[PDB]
Structure formats: structure tokens, C-alpha cells
């Protein structure tokens, strides 16, 4: 049973590390799209601030 548990541990660590690298790629791409989303949000924010100042003046 020690050897059986060792084999269980080996394919378990294989599958969890595969899922882990998948998760790393996923978190990286969503962090990137977080950067673009924040950039677009702030862009729209100050663009509308400027146009509203122009409207009031």
C-alpha cells in the first residue's frame, strides 16, 4: 500500500500541476484584461469630465 499510495500521489501531483499551470495562464490573461478595462474606464471618465467642463463653460 505504500507503493500504491506513492503512485496515487504521483498522478495526483501531475494532474494538480497541470490544472495549476492552466490557472496561472487564466489568471495572467484576466489580469491583463483588467489592465485594459481599467485603462478604458479611466479614459472614458476623464474624457467625459473634459467634455462636461466644456459644456458648462
Amino acid at each position: 500500500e505504500a507503493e500504491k499510495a506513492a503512485d496515487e500521489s504521483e498522478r495526483g501531483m501531475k494532474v494538480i500541476e497541470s490544472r495549476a499551470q492552466k490557472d496561472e495562464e487564466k489568471m495572467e490573461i484576466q489580469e491583463i484584461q483588467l489592465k485594459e478595462a481599467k485603462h478604458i474606464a479611466e479614459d472614458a471618465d476623464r474624457k467625459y469630465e473634459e467634455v462636461a467642463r466644456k459644456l458648462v463653460i
Binding site: 469630465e49 473634459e50 467642463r53 458648462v56 463653460i57
Partner: protein, 371 residues
């Protein structure tokens, strides 16, 4: 040959060869000294970090500006700034390159004399010249008349010029500038629970001031809006997290320009000084001076400053006078552009101060009619 156009200013040294569209090297003018002892041996730390390098080591250095208000108070630091500018940012030997220098109006003569002496003795430049920071801005705007408001980080001044003839008796100088605005923001951010004391985090406060501060068209209305609603609040991310939100303080910082009494100064606001300088001149050129207001300097880059200043000056000025304010996008670098244009002129080649002339006449040559 080519001419170098160095613009020391205060808090930002910008330089480049004459004839270029834009300055080549722009970096803060600070000198850093390590305030700790250093335990790791063999690294061999330098005893002074100068220029843009000191911005990356803010956490282990103390930053001292060699220029307080236009004038130079620490000459060794200024010499280090000049050496760094000539030998690292531009990587050009000043032995065979004339230099064009700028400084604010109404400055001590000793400052100019010592600058000239250091630049001929230490660096041995073939020739050099000193120009007013406002006339160059007037060149860069493609104008020949009108007044120019050069609100930098050290000093704010107005120079009325009509048809290329300056009016010395109408020049007004004010010591309120960007540094005082940063200090006032540091002081008023304490009421929200944020404490900034170290000289390193003064740069952080300057970053907030640049990024978020704006000039309000009306003060009382914006105060009421901020007190009632909360749509004017924005959040800024500090270098170590703990995002902070600033509300009413957003537009109180730049209002010091129009309300100098906030920092205790008795002098009048920017618009009032501009109007007083306008009416200090003659009566036959007031219309052209009204119609050709020119803005320059970094401090004049706040969003909505042009509209507020126009409204104030229109309220002061007679109703039957057209008022226009010229605010090009490149206000910050306008002075250097004008300096490059002036140095590229062919007729200016005879206005340089030759080294032989300096040796024959002494350091007092600059103040002489050979300006």
C-alpha cells in the same frame, strides 16, 4: 557647429541641441545623499545620486533642490547637475559647443555673474548667453506682442511685450509657484488622515497634485457640490497600496493661485496681478495686450485654468474689450522651443559672449550692454 539650449528652471532640467523640435533630455533637478550607513561591502556606493537616478532611490536618499526660487543656493549641487546634463544625458563634450541659458526676471546679479564664471571656468564653453524665460516663450508661440505668464515650479512672472519692445517698468514677479502648491497639498491632506513628512514622499504628493488636481470655474458652487454630493471624489494608488480618496481637497490646492491668502501671502491673485500689469502699461497698447494673453510653464497645465482665468480677467476688464487666452498643449516645453528657435537664428550668431571677450572684460561683461 551646433548650439546647446539648457533650461535649468527649478525642479526640472531640460536640454537639447538647437534646431531640434523638442528637448532631448528631461529629468528632475535633485541631488540625493544616502542617509544610512550601508552594511554590504564591496558594492562601492557613490556618495551622491544625481538626476533621474535619485528618483529610483527615493527610499534611501534625502532630496535637496539646488534651486529654491529661481536663484541657485547650493552651487556645488548645481555644478553636479550641469556636469550630469553635459556628460550623461547628452553625452557631448561642451568644449566646442555654445550654450544658451535661461533665468527668471528680477534676479540677483551675483547669480548671473557666478553662473557665467562657472560656465567659462569649469566647463570652458566657447560662448554662452542668458535669455529671459518669458521672451523665449513668446518666440515659441509665433507672436510678437502680448503678455506671457510663465508659472513654473520656482517663480511666477508676467512680462508685457509690444511689437518686440519689452516694458521693464510693468514686469510683475510673484514667488507663488508649484512648490508652494505641493506644500499646501501636503498640509491639507492631513485633515483626511494621511501624513506626508519625508522629502521622498513629497514626490508622491506631487504625483497626486499633477494627476488629480484641477481648477474650478466657481469656488462656492463647487464647494457646495462637494459638501452635498460625492461625485467629485477620486482614488489614487500609493506605491505601497492602501488606496486613498481625495474629495474637496481636489480643487482646493490649485485655488491658491487665485487665493494667495490660503498660504498667508498678502499679494493679490494671478488674475489680479495680470490685470494690474496690463493697466501698468500705456493706453494705446492695452487692446493688443488683452487680445494676446500667453500661458506657459508647468503650473499652468491644470484642467480648466484657462476658462477660470479668462472669466476673472473679463470680469475685471471693460466689457467692450475682447479677451483671449492662448493655451497651447505644449506649455511645459514652450520656453525650450523658443530658446531653440532663437539659437537657430542667423542674426543671433553675433550676440554670443566669446571667451576672449569674457577674459578681457571680466565676469561683469554679461550685465554690460553686451548682454
Amino acid at each position: 557647429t551646433t548650439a546647446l539650449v539648457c533650461d535649468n528652471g527649478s525642479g526640472l532640467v531640460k536640454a537639447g541641441f538647437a534646431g531640434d523640435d523638442a528637448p532631448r533630455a528631461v529629468f528632475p533637478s535633485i541631488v540625493g545623499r544616502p542617509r544610512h550607513q550601508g552594511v554590504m561591502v564591496g558594492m562601492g556606493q557613490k556618495d551622491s545620486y544625481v538626476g533621474d537616478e535619485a528618483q529610483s532611490k527615493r527610499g534611501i536618499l534625502t532630496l535637496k533642490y539646488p534651486i529654491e526660487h529661481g536663484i541657485i543656493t547650493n552651487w556645488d549641487d548645481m555644478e553636479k547637475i550641469w556636469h550630469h546634463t553635459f556628460y550623461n544625458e547628452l553625452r557631448v563634450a561642451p568644449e566646442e559647443h555654445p550654450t544658451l541659458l535661461t533665468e527668471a526676471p528680477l534676479n540677483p546679479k551675483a547669480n548671473r555673474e557666478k553662473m557665467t564664471q562657472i560656465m567659462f571656468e569649469t566647463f570652458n564653453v566657447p560662448a554662452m548667453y542668458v535669455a529671459i524665460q518669458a521672451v523665449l516663450s513668446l518666440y515659441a508661440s509665433g507672436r510678437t506682442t502680448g503678455i506671457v505668464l510663465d508659472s513654473g515650479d520656482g517663480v511666477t512672472h508676467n512680462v508685457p511685450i509690444y511689437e518686440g519692445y519689452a516694458l521693464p517698468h510693468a514686469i510683475m514677479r510673484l514667488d507663488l509657484a508649484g512648490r508652494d502648491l505641493t506644500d499646501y497639498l501636503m498640509k491639507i491632506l492631513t485633515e483626511r488622515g494621511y501624513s506626508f513628512v519625508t522629502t521622498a514622499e513629497r514626490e508622491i504628493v506631487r504625483d497626486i497634485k499633477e494627476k488629480l488636481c484641477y481648477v474650478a470655474l466657481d469656488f462656492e458652487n463647487e464647494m457646495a457640490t462637494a459638501a452635498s454630493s460625492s461625485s467629485l471624489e477620486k482614488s489614487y494608488e500609493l506605491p505601497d497600496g492602501q488606496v486613498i480618496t481625495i474629495g474637496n481637497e481636489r480643487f482646493r490646492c490649485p485655488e491658491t493661485l487665485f487665493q494667495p491668502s490660503f498660504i498667508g501671502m498678502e499679494s493679490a491673485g494671478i488674475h489680479e496681478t495680470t490685470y494690474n500689469s496690463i493697466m501698468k502699461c500705456d493706453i494705446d497698447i492695452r487692446k493688443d495686450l488683452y487680445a494676446n494673453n500667453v500661458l506657459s510653464g508647468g503650473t499652468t497645465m491644470y484642467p480648466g485654468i484657462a476658462d477660470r482665468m479668462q472669466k476673472e480677467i473679463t470680469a475685471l476688464a471693460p466689457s467692450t474689450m475682447k479677451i483671449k487666452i492662448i493655451a497651447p498643449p505644449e506649455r511645459k516645453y514652450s520656453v525650450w522651443i523658443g530658446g531653440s528657435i532663437l539659437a537657430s537664428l542667423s542674426t543671433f550668431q553675433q550676440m554670443w559672449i566669446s571667451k576672449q571677450e569674457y577674459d578681457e572684460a571680466g565676469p561683469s561683461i554679461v550685465h554690460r550692454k553686451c548682454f
